[PDB]
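Lab meeting, action items carried over

1. Structure of the five-component assembly. Owner: GW. Status: complete.
Input record:
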Amino acid sequence: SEHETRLVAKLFEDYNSVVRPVEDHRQAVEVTVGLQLIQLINVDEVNQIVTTNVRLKQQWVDYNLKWNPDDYGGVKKIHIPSEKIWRPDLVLYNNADGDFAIVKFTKVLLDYTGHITWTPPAIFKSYCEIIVTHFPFDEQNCSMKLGTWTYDGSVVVINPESDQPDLSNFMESGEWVIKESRGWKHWVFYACCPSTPYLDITYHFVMQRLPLYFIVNVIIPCLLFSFLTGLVFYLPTDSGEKMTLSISVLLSLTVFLLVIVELIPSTSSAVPLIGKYMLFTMVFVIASIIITVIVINTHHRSPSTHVMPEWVRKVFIDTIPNIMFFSTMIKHPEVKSAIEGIKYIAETMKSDQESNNAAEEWKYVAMVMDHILLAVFMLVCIIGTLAVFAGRLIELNQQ
Amino acid sequence: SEHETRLVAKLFEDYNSVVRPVEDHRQAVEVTVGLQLIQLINVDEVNQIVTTNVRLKQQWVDYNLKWNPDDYGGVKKIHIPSEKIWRPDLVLYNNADGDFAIVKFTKVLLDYTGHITWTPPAIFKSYCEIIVTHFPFDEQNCSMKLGTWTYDGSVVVINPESDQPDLSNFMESGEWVIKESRGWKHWVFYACCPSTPYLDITYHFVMQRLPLYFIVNVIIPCLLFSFLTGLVFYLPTDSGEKMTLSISVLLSLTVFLLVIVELIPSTSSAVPLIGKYMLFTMVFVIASIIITVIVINTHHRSPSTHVMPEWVRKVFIDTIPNIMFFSTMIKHPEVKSAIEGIKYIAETMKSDQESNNAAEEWKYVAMVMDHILLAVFMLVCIIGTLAVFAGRLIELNQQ
Amino acid sequence: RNQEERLLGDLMQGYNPHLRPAEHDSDVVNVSLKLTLTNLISLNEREEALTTNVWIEMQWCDYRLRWDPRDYGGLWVLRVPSTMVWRPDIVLENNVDGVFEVALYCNVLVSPDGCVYWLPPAIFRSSCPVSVTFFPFDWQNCSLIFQSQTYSTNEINLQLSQEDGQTIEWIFIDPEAFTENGEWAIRHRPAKMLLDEAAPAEEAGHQKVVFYLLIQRKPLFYVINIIAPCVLISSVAILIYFLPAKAGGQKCTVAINVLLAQTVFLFLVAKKVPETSQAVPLISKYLTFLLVVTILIVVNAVVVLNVSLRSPHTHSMARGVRKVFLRLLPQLPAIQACVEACNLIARARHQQTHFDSGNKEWFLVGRVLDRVCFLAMLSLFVCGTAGIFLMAHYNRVPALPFPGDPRSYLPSS
Amino acid sequence: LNEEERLIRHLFEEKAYNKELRPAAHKESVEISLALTLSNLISLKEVEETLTTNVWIEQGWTDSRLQWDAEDFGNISVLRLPADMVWLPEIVLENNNDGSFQISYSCNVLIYPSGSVYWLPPAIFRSSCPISVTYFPFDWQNCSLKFSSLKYTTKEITLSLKQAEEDGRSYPVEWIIIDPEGFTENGEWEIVHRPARVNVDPSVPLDSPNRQDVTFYLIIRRKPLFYVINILVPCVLISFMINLVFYLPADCGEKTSMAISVLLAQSVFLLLISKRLPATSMAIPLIGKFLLFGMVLVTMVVVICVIVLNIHFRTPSTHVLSEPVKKLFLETLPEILHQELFSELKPAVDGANFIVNHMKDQNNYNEEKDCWNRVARTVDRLCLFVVTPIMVVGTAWIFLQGAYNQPPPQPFPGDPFSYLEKDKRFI
Amino acid sequence: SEAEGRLREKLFSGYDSTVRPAREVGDRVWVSIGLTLAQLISLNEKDEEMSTKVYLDLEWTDYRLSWDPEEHEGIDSLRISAESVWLPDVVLLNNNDGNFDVALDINVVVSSDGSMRWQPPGIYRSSCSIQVTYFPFDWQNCTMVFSSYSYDSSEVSLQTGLSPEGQERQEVYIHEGTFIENGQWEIIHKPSRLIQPSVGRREEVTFYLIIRRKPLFYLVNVIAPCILITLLAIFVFYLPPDAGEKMGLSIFALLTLTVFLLLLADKVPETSLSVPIIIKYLMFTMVLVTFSVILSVVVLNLHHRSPHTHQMPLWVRQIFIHKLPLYLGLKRPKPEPPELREVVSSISYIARQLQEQEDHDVLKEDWQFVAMVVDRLFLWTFIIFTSVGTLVIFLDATYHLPPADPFP
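Predicted assembly:
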């Protein structure tokens, strides 16, 4: 276009992009700022960094970039490079692992009235404090503080375009759901510049994690392994396999604890819900191991080496009927040698019978102890799992 | 300063940075090159790349950048952007995943005599071949070959600033200690340019690893499991736990081998001695498992199924104890039916006692074999432990 | 912007940003430096790198950028791009990633008396040699060293910033910008200006400004998620002394499995500590101690099983049975065939009874051995745990930022 | 003044050099000679399928605008210039997978009085190398570096290989140059063939810049000692212990536990080996095939151990030992594989008879138990002699497929030329 | 050539590369966009990002860059640096890494009539929403949206680039001679569609790639080991209770399955809109092995019931000794002077003791036979459940096929 070529040559013959685009230096540049969240790329909990793809729409009037369309064949809007004009220097205060300002300098749309629209893209890696208290059912409020760096409120005034970020082009995430989003303008006095206030717009997004992945891949195996903890008390002591069950469960929960520990920040501000559950089932399994060792010791207590205490007999055999499908428990010297041998055999079987019967008393004590402990541990499993998860679950189902 | 402005205007009016800065094109530019190692960032062994922070001090003289200080207010030195002047094109020949040449163009100190000093920083990721033979007690020699790329020795002569690289500003590394460092100048004839020699300075650094981390995290657990191997032969066969011990120790040695695999490059120039040790203990445990299977099979041979060989009764019953010490081991139908039944009982128990005696002989053979194998395997474990490690350890302690 | 444009045109005529603001040669340009920590992003212990978000305030005065506000309609400040003015090439010397300069080259704020105020933001990754001796109950002394990459002491004077009569010898922390790290608490934050008196006065980087961060780890995560699991799973190893010394007792299964668990914990701990070799971590030494305790538990379980399952026909020892009983108290014509068969039956039962008695004696010997060794290993475990944890507990941060310096380097108020 | 300064002022100011114009007539093509010197084969990442190589790319052409008479300029016979001051053919690596088309360091060009421009920039190129996994760790790979111009077509430039001279006879350099003074050997990969070709595709149109290219191929063979020592030997030795369960007794010996532990070890090996190779579907790795075969064999042996334990723990009160099974598994297979005296004494005689009958019943029970145990042992020995040959044969077959794999004798099948320096083709 | 230099000087006299070539106000610049896939580098499911190497094919007209070849020595085409001419601001809108522009700056081919052809290379990383339900037997529909970043539809209008075959070709071009197929993905369909906005976005050209995974790696490395471990879990019920190895087999099979799940977690997508079918299979197998552990504990409990303490309920006797064994084919083998005075007393005591032991053994054998019947019933039940569940899951996976039509 020859008209637009002449216009662009005329507008930038004596243009200065250093100075603010005002007729008088005493007035401020009014800027309208609007964030458009295109995609929520990542929420790194370990490093506490939120990666978002955004478009930072900025609108402002330039005094020296006006023209009459009648003088230029009716041209009313043009597209010009942004690097050649004055721009607001909008900086993300809470940047963590990225660029502080815009680095992609896309074209600006310039109207004949001096109005400039500049909508650059950006990949903001902002800092979000990650609260782990309800992980993997946690809610995270992550903010983005955008403000002019070197221009105070007296020389450049930024205004929000809308009360909320623009989510009309937001690609839905497979891990997070944005519950609420809101942009607030703040006037802040900094110690570096105590005279004038500096303006900022903080855009915050409340995000609810979708917990299906962590439920399937972490929680369900842990529930399966914790359910097998109490079943050690239904195993007989004569099988010689109680320790196998308990120890394998303990090792599996140890591996899963490593997996969960690799998934959360090392901050000390809160203990995660899943970590609390893991420690609970670990103490549960170790208690099961201790009382299983006690049960095995009681079962194998040799009656010759151990006398039955009368209090144990009262507590376990006499007391505790509950369901009692149990029972509760001439004249040759050769002839003389035969008499002595037969008597010795009979007395030996007498002694063996009494020793065996005392052994079964010990085994019966162990059996009833196992039957009480099975019910106790099975109930404790459900009670602990509910007491951990159900509070957050009913909170989410009730909100 | 106004005089400095006048000077810098005077120096760069007809200056050409393309031209070599000498009075005559037939003479060479004399460049003094010195390397200052600031920090050994990394010695990546798997990728065989050494990352270092360095300062590459280059000094020369520019013929066309001289001035009289009396004519410019007594200015004897100035600072000039390095991009405005001719520079030597030093390149790191053995670049692996970095920049061949200097990319950060700091300023140059220029004297009134034309002397230029330029000290750019660099992050050099060079190629060090990793001799894995004595890992983790290993010593690595890494070179840095620096030379002018396009200028042969007849047009640009590089000279080392000193024999040794400058380690005055070196931050000491926690994993490596530099024992020796030296720079050597070389006149190399390349196939691309047969007629002229190209100069290079190769700065080499000998480094000795500090092995405490690998001693604590790898060697000590592995030694503990190697010691755990030997106790299977002192464990009785009546406990039913020999195989569990053996295969568990084996599994642990597998996971240690496949992490030490991850900690070492996959080159075939040499096999690490830690890998030799792990293969040695793997074969040791596997021989232990095979021999334990033989012992277990021997412990339950019975006269009903196996007859005692004469050589076994010659060796393991009388010859082995010589080196060891043990115990070296009115008639009526009903009436006559009762008498014959008592005869049957007596014969049955006598036969059972004979069978038990033969079984006990087999158990005693298993017991003496277990003692011999306990001694042999403990001694073999100690000998293999010392033989692998004693060489490098005494070499380093004598060093 | 008529007055701003007029002033920028007037000031930038003949201005060379590559030349120092020395009105007369041999003059030294005073550069005031202040640091404001906005967020301590991380301390990567493996790479030994401290990532910090900072605002680095640099102040100096350019005699070439002076103007009278009355000549320019009362304009008393000008925002100029930082590339068009001269700057001191202040860089972080101890950077790890090769990034020497600030991130964003924002505008400078020039004042009528010529004094330039630059306050860029930066994400600096400095080199912090991590001391691991008391991990996770450790504190680290990281440093940020700032110096001019170009100019020497005779050319610029790099000083700390001064408030109204007071020198700001500390990292500033604005409450309106600071965010607390969830893992690290800043205990001391001094600042110093270091000028080696005997160094050359012609080389550039010899006057430095060092900002130190003494940071204490918050160890709640590591105690809850790593240490207490390890302690309890090691206590499980102690329980094998109560299991019976027979088949089905399952001593070795328990002991070797808890050994595998402790090795897994050692693997987990090794991931979170550097590969340096200045010292062994506290938690690593505790893990090695627990491993050795479990190995000795396995050794004694094997010995106890061997003693308990010793056959009477194999061998006997009169001294061994005596010593345990000493310690047990502190611990607490058809008739001819008929009679021949009857005698054989009785003698067989006698032999069975004697064999059973010998087995019972061996069983008691094994039980006594297990009981005596239980208390010794419990004492070893408890003493080692208590000693290591007290050593952890007594690793407090020093009271003062610098040993030998009575000063606290904290702001007045 | 410097003759270099005079010459630059002559070539670039007096004659007004324009780097945007080709050094040729409009309907004439510039001949670009290309060679490649491999300084270091940095890596071949199989999972990412990327070859990282350090290479000096030698480009040569003639620029008649940059010629001078050496006599008029103090017998100056060479000049170093920035590469951005002259027209360049702009040769790029088309096979890059990271997006870095251009050389790394844009060094100077050397120009001679005849007008010949010579450029030798270094580069670290990351090219796409599809990987064959069928014989890992005994595999060989065929990577290629394809160089072409995206700015110019065959009408505008003509790519060709560098020509060298021997005793006055000119030949083309049809191989990757390996300078002994600038080459470092890779510890894992040895170069078997290193040819170089000029490819012209007649299918694509003449106006396409992709019609012509120069391809430098690297056929490389892995050195398998690392994987043989560290991976294959442990896994094979662990796998072959599954035969040992057949020697373990059926009462004390934990046959099933040992066998499933071998299975767990094989699973760990397989899963950790799958991470060292890409997830392609062209073929299964040799080691992967071996581990799958071993896992299936271990599963069969565990099932066999379950059946043997089932047979061993049989009793008269549960199963009847049929005479056919008895004869088959205890005789046939083991052979090939290798008046007071009435009334007052009635209590005594009755008790004696009952005791005797109880003892006889117990003895018969015990003999039946022993017969079941021997049947189980015979089954164990038969399964040993059936399973161990199968495992040995399969292992030997798989690893002989592995060992006998070698690269082709020639770089290109169907082309007899060896692409070696000794066989240089003078023309 | 000097003629080329003079022509270039003539064309770029008073030419502004930042001004759109609109001869009249209100004129549209028609841009034709085509794509050529050189390599499908990867589809990373964890990052949900498709990495590709492509050659764009952008065609338009610049009326300011036309000339008469007869007046310029027959020069009818020029290859000009792409920064010296106006370019459409065409960008990959749906990029994932923040990189919008092309990979290399190359020449634009300008014809004497002003026709501009630009074929830049580009290494792109676009966003792809991974449908995880049938992974690894899944097909993905990954899109590449190309649009002008700045110019609106009234200024620059897009259209699909026709191949030399013409006919308004709507497809990604792949040169079968040089294209190397990805080893993990097969391109089923590859259309191209001009999406025009409703009545606020602008016109875009979307290139779709329907790509089907080749699941041989996951079949070999994951599915078959899981089938083997499940088959092993079946045979715990054929193991005797007297061997004392049921717990070890079942629990360590569960541990192996857990190991497989954890070491498969590095490959599966990490979204939460669905569950992969392979993860469903692993969870089913883990639950089945857990139930096998539970019922093995039950069987071991039944086998070791002390006869003197536990009296068998009569209903247990009827169901598990009389009724079920006939149905399960588990027939029980059984169809069902002073010295002399003292010696007589002793012998009577021996006979009574052996009688009592016989009764105890009978009750113990009855309990063990009940445990055995329960074990066989559970063996058959687990065979049925395993086979049915595996068949259902495998038929659900195998019958998931890529579409026959790109745009239903």
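2. GW to write a short summary for the group page. Key points so far: Residues 338-398 of chain E form the longest helix (61 residues). The CA atoms of residues 17 and 87 of chain E lie 8 Å apart.
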